[PDB]
């Protein structure tokens, strides 16, 4: 369960003595742990990528708790994400507000800042992740 060491909260499994790791459901809340410490970021759960957010981002969530986050972009540590109606980060080719993006399969982060090979073809992405016109 939850213990406080120095000042931060850690979670341990009832079968171990070292902190939990990976995606976990705890009393209707979602977390992604690293050596017991909830991680902030966009990580893969059982139904896609969730936003495990800084505390008090939505509905008084705690640090690392997954949140509702609908129909909007997120900038996180310089990486660009887009979240759909179901609060999951989109992947692959997407058209958003008339612009095309490609969200990478391993991370859900937008391809950005030049040429990428995707599906065997070379494409160009602006610094903002927007696919540029024409053939590359």
């Amino acid at each position, epitope marked *: 369960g939850w213990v406080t060491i120095d000042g931060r909260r850690y979670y341990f499994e009832p079968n171990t003595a070292i902190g939990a790791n990976g995606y976990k459901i705890i009393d209707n809340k979602n977390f992604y742990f690293r050596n017991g410490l909830p991680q902030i970021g966009v990580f893969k759960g059982p139904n896609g990528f969730e936003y495990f957010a800084p505390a008090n981002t939505d509905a008084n969530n705690i640090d690392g708790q997954a949140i509702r986050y609908q129909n909007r972009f997120l900038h996180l540590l310089g990486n660009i994400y887009y979240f759909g109606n179901n609060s999951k980060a989109v992947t692959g080719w997407q058209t958003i507000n008339g612009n095309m993006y490609y969200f990478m399969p391993d991370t859900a982060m937008a*391809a950005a*800042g*030049g*040429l*990428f*090979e*995707i599906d*065997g*073809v*070379i494409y160009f992405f602006g610094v903002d992740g927007v696919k540029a016109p024409g053939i*590359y």
Partner: nanobody
Amino acid sequence: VKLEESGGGLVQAGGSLRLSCAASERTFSRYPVAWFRQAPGAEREFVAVISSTGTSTYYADSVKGRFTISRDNAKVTVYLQMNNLKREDTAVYFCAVNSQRTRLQDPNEYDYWGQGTQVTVSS
């Protein structure tokens, strides 16, 4: 993933030269491969890149129409065919593999490099 370059030397302006970049392993064929060129004391500037599939290419505006990048799956080799060569093309040429398929114009994104070979165009 070891890369061996060949084909370097000297040509007159307007002439042609073909460079080869041969890999030691079949995994090479799964990744995009680029050529960069470098003048003495200068930085490695982008020339051309080819997709893993061999059918998608991008050229520096400077060389579009004159240079062709291609690959031979059976030989695990990428080529740079240089036509209508100009003195401006004189440089050391490198081939390189970008296994992450990310930001293909940027040499810092490339994780394996050939040894580099001198091309000289005399006018």
